[PDB]
């Protein structure tokens, strides 16, 4: 049966936190390989040339981000297998960000001209790069709490987070609320449009990020539902910490709702 | 029963030819939207900074290409169901090059510095666009027969052709010949390595090309083997003309080989 | 029945210590047979001539060795039949190092020009050669604790140790952990590549060392699994102290894990 | 049933001739990588330093080789299944000489000072390098007809040929003639000893050549006797052109003698 | 049944002691027939002309004899039927040294020039010949405890002792320790080579000594195992006191080993 | 059955003739290794120091050899299986003389003082030692037909021939003529006495020759009678051409006598 394991969720949380820290450190390291990165003219793209620069394009995208988390944690509160939900979400997020780190290290591609005014630069020594990494870690990347002061690289994390939250929200509700699913979909597409129209990422970057998160999420859910982690030695699943997480769960997780407060 | 439909192979070949012409025409549109494409500084990668440029590394990849195509024709000659193989191959290449057209249209990504001496430019009119289109089409894009005079763009097709031919060669030979398979894999790896070391394309270009070819090839083979084109309305398959092309053949194609010449 | 005998492991450890001391003394003696060994021009190799010397490339090999040793210690801690594993590892390493001594005494093949600054030399007598042997013995031969001051000779031991530890880690873990196996393989390959690129040994030395360790390991384990130590007079096994160590063990050793500590 | 295939032996002979030509060309090109190779002090060996040079010690090896060749020809003449023997000998020697090419291209190990009077050198171009290759090929490499004028490199071929012919003579005679076997063993040992005492190869070269020939011969014959070419996909035998040559032969080859001449 | 007779071993040991005394007597008497025996030129051999004399090659033989003797008493201690072994060994040595006495008495063959500085000579009388005889007897004939001051004679006894101890070690230690047998054979071969190369004995003397020891040992073992002392009057065996010695023992001696100490 | 083979005795004759020629050539070449050989004083032996040299001591021994072969051919003429005797006699004489050649090559031991007047010496060339070999071959070594002009070496052939003839004569007659056996025995001992008193050989040489011929003859006859040449792989008889000669003969050879003349 489905036994709720309370000592594995914290392991997933620390794992995803270490993944975020490694991503921030790799970002800091890679931001050094090019000193200026703000003098070249932009590469010819289809979308960013038609629409002129709209200064406030970031605000609503990220605010839609917290709307998505808000609905996500409300669905979390009243659903009985919350532990499995928090066990799957971090386990997927860490792997996606590890792929982002690998793509980051292989190739760097930014937007040539945005945040040409961020100051600092050339921190050559061991002591203070850790300070930048800790800042962008405990700043969580929003532009409201100013950490994202200069440019951004290939494989934007905003798109991945938005799509992952939308999919997790839409998949763990009963299949009769087809109005919240539509709202989440239009909300995610609005966020995608706005970040693309912010002139900070190229169309190919957002497209491959969206495709990668969708494919990884669907593949993980199909593998979990099929229950092939122990059926046979089918394909030697390469997902980081997959069998150690879903071995205690057999079959598909139901969608029963309850209330963990004994004070009606 | 396997009925060789000889009136559908011509349609597939015509479709592939118009696809190639369309690809040439789209490239014709693409390489005029920014004038210079040669004054920019190269983007920082890991494999374009360590290994210096080699000026004979761009023809060994193609030599491997002709080797692989000759091997594929040799395999095609001695096969009972030649029409089905020639049908599937063209159907795959059409979709792959449509994807190439799309990804080149959305964004243009080049190598800033190679083939800077190529002449022409400022070709603004309607009449002679078809001229370079026909030249690139009936020059087949090799660097030996000089057509590839200026630089190349996103989603290189050389790796696409090499990977498709390699996988087709390894697929339709009896499963005891994995010494030719080793040779084909070595040829594909050498072609990829020389493409990368010729300073013709970025690393992510080659990686996404290889991954998309492998994924499309394996997915199409699984779909064809599972005879899901008419079993049920599973996903409304998105392949250009798939049900039209594979409806007359049921089950998995065997590995019976014969000799079409009746003169021993 | 598997009987863990604690009075044979001490014998195996003593045997390995004696073999290591003999190897150190033989190396000390061999270092005298050539006066300079540091003025000749290096022989033309295909790896030593393409990649210039990397000054820091030798410590990474010992780092990989330390990581593999830590993993092997962890495996030995959590195994039911630890004594048999410890008896087998020593019984293999002793034979391999005896072969190293023989092939070092047959011919001396050094690298002419590395560690050319090392002092000492011409310590001709019986009284202080043993001092150098004792230093090399109780310095463990690593360059971190500086004992390896002059060059090294044929049949390098670093590759032997790395390959033996990697094979023992790979084989004595459950056959479902196929990411630890890949990590160990990557570590071993990187160690071999670094020892080759540090201008420390010729390519043939590393290749023959790897082949000899692999063949000896596979042959010994096949003989142990086939119980050919008592089945018949097949070949009069030439492994030093083989039948004595495996007479009490029948069949193959299972993979049961436990915790020797009785305080949960 | 043993079917003597008369159309495969020609293929084996052609394969051996091609391999020999390739080996000669690779030796010719390898000889250029070091300018002098005749001024360095020799490496300290234990056999090259005890026994001074004997000027006439090299022709005895070729005399023993000719005696063994005559005995093997006599055995081949009076055997029922001559074709299989001729098809096996070539298929083994080709692989061994390919291994020789690989291990002598990887590293070069010559004797610095013997045949120091040989003239020629620096024939740099493509037109007359093939002339040197042709001379070495159609001189058979024997010193009686002077072609082997300068030094030789690692993995000597004289020991390979002697050991292969000795093993073929020993194994393919009735198991009651144990004085011919002793004579062949004595001839092979004397040939190896004269090779070592003629100051032509280091001890490790001869030892590894002998071991490699013995191991390859025993492995090939064990695989042929156990009939593993069609039993299952055990290990995918790496012998070049192995399954093709032994497909029609089942079991083991008997030892019935006859006389092909029909005029008693 | 094997009944250990402890009243017959003493007789055999006493007989051996009188045999040794008579051997010293015969050597002393024979030494007086030729006054000088040191001015002759050496007889031409094949092995006394190539290798020059080595001054330390005479003590290594006795070191090998001592270690073989120690191994022999180690085997003697742990044997159930120790008395039978001690009876047979002494019975063999008595006959061998009687034949040695005979072959010195008929003819004298010496090495002309070694130990030419030994003093004494011309000791013609009865009284003090007993003194030198007793010195040779209770000096046991080693060169370390200096008794062997002058030259030696035909049919060297060093090879006799080495071969007898070697064959006794290999026969009466169970038939599967086929590593100790190799060590004993190597020791015997090294002893023979050193006594030959020490310019102490002619080659024919060593060869006939080895042959006679091997023949007598094997013949006695076959005679004892076949139990021909009472089967019939076959040939009236000529061995000194053979039927009186092995009358009790019936059949082949088994190889049961025990521990005579009752204090674990 | 016992079939007379007439095409094998000629092989025996040619084999023994080649052995005789090889012995003569070896004697000729070995005679060169000492120039003078006639200045040393005789070694101390018991028998040649007592009785003075008899100048006419050689003749009667050799004419008694003539008597021996006379009675041998008389027995040959009137016995039915003469072919088997002519096969065995030469097959044994060849092996004995090969042993004589080996022992002559290893060590040379002569009589220093007899035949001081033979002239010639120092034939340093290639041409004329063959003349001496041919002379001593087609002079058959008698002292009557003067060829044997100087001294002889160890392993005298006269003793071997006399003993072999005596044994062959005494074994192939019915066991009821115990007066001719006594005549042959006293005749043989007379020949031995006379040749050893001719101051022509040492006692040890004659004793060794007699023992070797007796042992070889008895061993060959026991092997032939036991019929172990095909019973099993007992000891792999080392006799030169043993199984080839005695495979057509089964059991013991009888002693039926007849007359091959049809003219009574
Ligand atoms: C429930 C999941 C919460 C995840 C929140 C993401 C925080 C990542 C910060 C780690 C530092 C790495 C630096 C940069 C990258 O992360 C990229 C680069 O722009 N920035 C980002 O992705 C920032 C994503 C902002 C939109 C998230 C909306 C969901 C809000 C949940 C808040 C509790
Ligand atoms: C059998 C199929 C052959 C197709 C080969 C290329 C045809 C593409 C024509 C369409 C117009 C676009 C032109 C060029 C682009 O495609 C890209 C841009 O760099 N260049 C290319 O692809 C050129 C790839 C050459 C390597 C192929 C080696 C295999 C040899 C087989 C020859 C029969
Ligand atoms: C777990 C097994 C530990 C074995 C360590 C052996 C230490 C030296 C003993 C042999 C004496 C002869 C001296 C030197 C030669 O052996 C060669 C010369 O290059 N140096 C060596 O091999 C030294 C091996 C270095 C790599 C080991 C990495 C694994 C780390 C485990 C250590 C706890
Ligand atoms: C029956 C087998 C015949 C094989 C003869 C091979 C002749 C050379 C062909 C290979 C081309 C490369 C050239 C040289 C190298 O190979 C090495 C260099 O040291 N020379 C060799 O190996 C030549 C081996 C000589 C000893 C053979 C004795 C057996 C007598 C048969 C003679 C016809
Ligand atoms: C266990 C029995 C050991 C006996 C060995 C010889 C004892 C003396 C024999 C009788 C007196 C004649 C004296 C000498 C002659 O025999 C010859 C002439 O050179 N010298 C010898 O033999 C001396 C042979 C020494 C080497 C043997 C090594 C074994 C060590 C065992 C010691 C307990
Ligand atoms: C039927 C057997 C015939 C044997 C005849 C042997 C003649 C040559 C022997 C071998 C060639 C080497 C030459 C000489 C040495 O051997 C020694 C030198 O001292 N001379 C010998 O031994 C010759 C021994 C003569 C005494 C025997 C007499 C009977 C002869 C019968 C012949 C019809």
UniProtKB/Swiss-Prot annotation, chains A, B, C, D, E, F:
Cytoplasmic compartment residues: 225-264
Catalytic residue positions: 158, 201, 205
Subcellular location: Endoplasmic reticulum membrane
Spans traversing the lipid bilayer: 10-30, 58-78, 89-109, 134-154, 179-199, 204-224
A GO term from the CC aspect: plasma membrane
GO MF assignments: ceramide cholinephosphotransferase activity; sphingomyelin synthase activity
Protein EC: 2.7.8.-
Consequence of changing residue 205 to E: Abolishes CPE synthase activity
EC top class named in words: transferase
Chief site of localization: endoplasmic reticulum
Domain of life: Eukaryota
One GO process term, biological-process aspect: regulation of ceramide biosynthetic process
Residues forming coiled coils: none
Keyword set, alphabetical order: Endoplasmic reticulum, Lipid metabolism, Membrane, Sphingolipid metabolism, Transferase, Transmembrane, Transmembrane helix
Membrane topology listed for this record: Multi-pass membrane protein
Pathway as given in its UniProt record: Sphingolipid metabolism
Reaction equation(s) it catalyzes: an N-acylsphing-4-enine + a 1,2-diacyl-sn-glycero-3-phosphoethanolamine = an N-acylsphing-4-enine 1-phosphoethanolamine + a 1,2-diacyl-sn-glycerol; an N-acylsphinganine + a 1,2-diacyl-sn-glycero-3-phosphoethanolamine = an N-acylsphinganine-1-phosphoethanolamine + a 1,2-diacyl-sn-glycerol; an N-acyl-(4R)-4-hydroxysphinganine + a 1,2-diacyl-sn-glycero-3-phosphoethanolamine = an N-acyl-(4R)-4-hydroxysphinganine-1-phosphoethanolamine + a 1,2-diacyl-sn-glycerol; N-hexadecanoylsphinganine + a 1,2-diacyl-sn-glycero-3-phosphoethanolamine = N-hexadecanoyl-sphinganine-1-phosphoethanolamine + a 1,2-diacyl-sn-glycerol
Family stated for the protein in its record: Belongs to the sphingomyelin synthase family.
Free-text note on domains in this protein's UniProt record: The SAM domain is required to retain SMAD8 in the endoplasmic reticulum.
Function: Synthesizes sphingolipids through transfer of a phosphatidyl head group from a glycerophospholipid on to the primary hydroxyl of a ceramide in the lumen of the endoplasmic reticulum.
Protein name from the UniProt record: Sphingomyelin synthase-related protein 1
Native species: Homo sapiens (Human)
